[PDB]
């Protein structure tokens, strides 16, 4: 009971629900993003969470070692590793910013208050631009000294020192902590509720605009955010569930996890939009013109909310300590999963583990050094747009198609019944077989066909930036066909002989050899 309670609480609050969710909610309107989020969640987030839990718990192997049930579909074990590496590249800049803010918040006069600092412009408006946004973009990022993604400039030494500290802390780390976010968020929520002009920001939150529901960006954003929040599509759920006993049940875990995650996301968006409405009322501007729909929205929103609070310095220190802890936890989880999977896959990198871990850490630091330069927000935006999205949805769709069609929904249900004593009902089987793959395929095709170039406020990325982004997405996406070709060419025999062992499970060896392959009959495919 205590261990199970602490298990659900751990996944409840993370960097996805605190940082990315309000950004994507403000970008898409507020309710026109809430509707697709719930629609995609209740349909294809719980079934995939349950499927990943059961697969990991039964196979008792890592992200790549599970695929002995469909030997040809193993490139999705390296696709997820590449995706996690790409995410971890830009996942450290958030922690560097948090460290910078925590260090700079150790004073009696906060710097994001008034328009008298050396990093200000004649456009600054004290109750143009706000002092908090001007501080973030001109005294921390120094974005005004870069023309665009073409003109980056040398890295800054302060953010480089913060990055080095983050890297060493992560490497050496790789009751009180688990309850600080709840208290801090409750204080912020109460303060935002009891503020003038918050009702407008709440009305703008709980109101659906049908004109944006006919687009595609909001559907793609909701689909990607569901996977980012729940944790599916990264290969960490399978690795974690590899040690989840055998008799532990998975549907009860999935239901509670999904419910708590949804509640936390809703509360975070509520707080952010309430403060947005207050500031819009204060500055005599509409809610849609307060700030830019960029990744650094919380770093502009939250300093002002702390400033409107008594004893603002202590609250600032506590908030940024909490943010640093959350980022460290998420980064540790991702890097641990990547390293463990790579070590397990190759038996050569087992006598040399510390060297491999040091090499991975060094490479991640070197490739994350690109976002510390003057124009690093452009590289951050490009990575955020292109590392996840089409690649993660493609990997999730391939995993679902494999596990369901190529293996057997009935066989998966029989395995689950053997594991836990209860065979899944018709809702789960139908969702695994038909409902989820169709909605994933539609989203993938829509995302691929539609253009949607990235931008940062008013900067428009050139053609070569989009080409590079598509290159780095395709690099992760294209691990399935190459492994399929290698596996097909490695097996011996003829076309039928190779195809028999390429798709049948490794537990089916004694039966495929004696002229009996289950995947060669219509009844196997036509069953739900």
Binding residues for chloride: 225, 229, 265
Residue 205 binds what, of ligand CXQ, ligand NAG, none (CB under 5 to 8 Å, by partner type)? Answer: none
Our CB check for ligand CXQ shows the closer of 52 and 137 to be 52
Hey, how many other C-beta atoms are within 10 angstroms of the C-beta on 371? 24
Residue 333 binds what, of ligand CXQ, ligand NAG, none (CB under 5 to 8 Å, by partner type)? Answer: ligand CXQ
* Alpha-carbon dihedral angle through residues 364, 366, 367, 373, given to the nearest 10 degrees: 130
Q: Is 87 in the site for ligand CXQ (CB under 6 A)?
A: yes
Residue 332 binds what, of ligand NAG, ligand CXQ, none (CB under 5 to 8 Å, by partner type)? Answer: ligand CXQ
Report the site for ligand CXQ in 2-31 (rule: CB under 6 A): 10-11, 14, 16
In whole angstroms, the minimum distance from the beta carbon of 367 to ligand CXQ comes to 16
Q: How many helices (H) and strands (E) does the chain have?
A: 27, 2
Q: Is 368 in the site for ligand CXQ (CB under 6 A)?
A: no
Q: Is 329 in the site for ligand CXQ (CB under 6 A)?
A: yes
Report d(CA 44, CA 371) in Å as an integer: 34
Going by C-alpha positions, the residue among 316, 330, 368, 308 that lies closest to residue 11 is: 330
In whole angstroms, the minimum distance from the beta carbon of 164 to ligand CXQ comes to 22
Residue 508 binds what, of ligand NAG, ligand CXQ, none (CB under 5 to 8 Å, by partner type)? Answer: none
Q: Is 294 in the site for ligand CXQ (CB under 6 A)?
A: no
Count of residues for the chain?
528
Cα atoms in the Cβ-side hemisphere of radius 13 Å centred on 295: 20
Q: Is 236 in the site for ligand CXQ (CB under 6 A)?
A: yes
Q: Which residues contact 84 (CB under 8 A, 6 or more apart)?
A: 234, 235, 236, 334, 337, 338
Radius of gyration for the alpha carbons in the chain, expressed in angstroms and rounded: 24
x-marked contacts with ligand CXQ along 467-506 as a string, rule CB under 6 A: ----------------------------------------
Binding-site positions for dopamine read 14, 84, 88, 228, 330-331
Our CB check for ligand NAG shows the closer of 121 and 186 to be 121
Report d(CA 307, CA 309) in Å as an integer: 5
Residue 121 binds what, of ligand NAG, ligand CXQ, none (CB under 5 to 8 Å, by partner type)? Answer: ligand NAG
Going by C-alpha positions, the residue among 409, 418, 474, 415 that lies closest to residue 437 is: 409
Residue 140 binds what, of ligand CXQ, ligand NAG, none (CB under 5 to 8 Å, by partner type)? Answer: none
In whole angstroms, the minimum distance from the beta carbon of 228 to ligand NAG comes to 32
Residue 123 binds what, of ligand CXQ, ligand NAG, none (CB under 5 to 8 Å, by partner type)? Answer: ligand NAG
Q: Is 334 in the site for ligand CXQ (CB under 6 A)?
A: yes
Residue 94 binds what, of ligand NAG, ligand CXQ, none (CB under 5 to 8 Å, by partner type)? Answer: none
179 burial type by CB count under 10 A (0-12 exposed, 13-18 middle, 19+ buried) = exposed
Cα atoms in the Cβ-side hemisphere of radius 13 Å centred on 89: 25
Cα atoms in the Cβ-side hemisphere of radius 13 Å centred on 394: 25
Can you say whether residue 398 is alpha, beta or left, with left for phi > 0 and alpha for psi between -120 and 50 degrees? alpha
Going by C-alpha positions, the residue among 161, 150, 169, 85 that lies closest to residue 369 is: 161
In whole angstroms, the minimum distance from the beta carbon of 84 to ligand CXQ comes to 6
Report d(CA 291, CA 111) in Å as an integer: 19
Binding-site positions read 10, 12-14, 17, 84, 88, 225, 228-229, 261, 265, 326, 329-331
121 burial type by CB count under 10 A (0-12 exposed, 13-18 middle, 19+ buried) = exposed
In whole angstroms, the minimum distance from the beta carbon of 296 to ligand NAG comes to 17
In whole angstroms, the minimum distance from the beta carbon of 404 to ligand CXQ comes to 23
Residue 202 binds what, of ligand NAG, ligand CXQ, none (CB under 5 to 8 Å, by partner type)? Answer: none
Q: Is 224 in the site for ligand CXQ (CB under 6 A)?
A: no
Report d(CA 487, CA 481) in Å as an integer: 10
| Mode of pairing for the β-strands spanning 455-456 and 459-460 | antiparallel
Residue ranges in contact with ligand NAG by CB under 6 A: 116, 121, 123
Report d(CA 4, CA 452) in Å as an integer: 42
In whole angstroms, the minimum distance from the beta carbon of 229 to ligand CXQ comes to 8
Our CB check for ligand CXQ shows the closer of 110 and 166 to be 166
Q: Is 322 in the site for ligand CXQ (CB under 6 A)?
A: no
Q: Which residues contact 70 (CB under 8 A, 6 or more apart)?
A: 402, 403, 406, 407, 503, 505
Q: Which residues contact 490 (CB under 8 A, 6 or more apart)?
A: none
Q: Which of 56, 77, 192, 333 binds ligand CXQ (CB under 6 A)?
A: 333
Structure tokens at 56: 């990991």
Residues that bind ligand CXQ (CB under 6 A): 10-11, 14, 16, 87, 231, 234, 236, 329-330, 332-334
């Amino acid at each position: 009971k205590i261990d199970f309670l602490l298990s659900v609480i751990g996944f409840a609050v993370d960097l996805a629900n605190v940082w990315r969710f309000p950004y994507l909610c403000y970008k898409n309107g507020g309710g026109a993003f809430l509707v697709p989020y719930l629609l995609f969640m209740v349909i294809a987030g719980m079934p995939l969470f349950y499927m990943e839990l059961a697969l990991g718990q039964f196979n008792r192997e890592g992200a790549a070692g599970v695929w002995k049930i469909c030997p040809i579909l193993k490139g999705v074990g390296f696709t997820v590793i590449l995706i996690s590496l790409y995410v971890g590249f830009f996942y450290n800049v958030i922690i560097a910013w948090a460290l910078h803010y925590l260090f700079s918040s150790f004073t009696t006069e906060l710097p994001w208050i008034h328009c008298n600092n050396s990093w200000n412009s004649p456009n600054c408006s004290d109750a143009g631009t706000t002092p908090a946004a001007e501080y973030f973009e001109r005294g921390v990022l120094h974005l005004h000294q870069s023309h665009g993604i073409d003109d980056l400039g040398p890295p800054r030494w302060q953010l480089t020192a913060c990055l080095v500290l983050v890297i060493v802390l992560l490497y050496f780390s790789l009751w009180i902590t688990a309850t600080m976010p709840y208290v801090v968020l409750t204080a912020l929520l109460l303060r935002g509720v009891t503020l003038p002009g918050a009702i407008d920001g709440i009305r703008a939150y709980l109101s659906v605009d049908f004109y944006r529901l006919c687009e595609a960006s909001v559907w793609i954003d909701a689909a990607t955010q569901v996977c980012f929040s729940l944790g599916v599509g990264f290969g960490v759920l399978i690795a974690f569930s590899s040690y989840n006993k055998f008799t532990n049940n998975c549907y009860r875990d999935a239901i509670v996890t999904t419910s708590i995650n949804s509640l936390t996301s809703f509360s975070s968006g509520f707080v952010v939009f309430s403060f947005l409405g207050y500031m819009a009322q204060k500055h005599s501007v509409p809610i849609g013109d307060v700030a830019k729909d960029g990744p650094g929205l919380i770093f502009i929103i939250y300093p002002e909310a702390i400033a409107t609070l008594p004893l603002s310095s202590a609250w600032a220190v506590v908030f940024f300590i909490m943010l640093l802890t959350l980022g460290i936890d998420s980064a540790m989880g991702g890097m641990e999963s990547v390293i463990t999977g790579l070590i397990d896959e190759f038996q050569l990198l087992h006598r040399h583990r510390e060297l491999f871990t040091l090499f991975i850490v060094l490479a991640t630091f070197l490739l994350s050094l690109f976002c510390v330069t003057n124009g690093g927000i452009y590289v951050f935006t490009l990575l955020d747009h292109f590392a996840a999205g089409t690649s993660i949805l493609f990997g999730v769709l391939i995993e679902a198609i494999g596990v369901a069609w190529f293996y057997g929904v009935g066989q998966f249900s029989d395995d689950i019944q053997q594991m836990t004593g209860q065979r899944p009902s018709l809702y789960w089987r139908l969702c695994w077989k038909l409902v989820s793959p169709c909605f994933l395929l539609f989203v993938v095709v829509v995302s691929i066909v539609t253009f949607r170039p990235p931008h940062y406020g008013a900067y428009i990325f050139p053609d070569w930036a989009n080409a590079l982004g598509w290159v780095i997405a395709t690099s992760s996406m294209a691990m399935v066909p190459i492994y399929a070709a290698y596996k097909f060419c490695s097996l011996p025999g003829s076309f039928r002989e190779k195809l028999a062992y390429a798709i049948a499970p490794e537990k089916d060896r004694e039966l495929v050899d004696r002229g009996e392959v289950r995947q060669f009959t219509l009844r196997h495919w036509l069953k739900v």
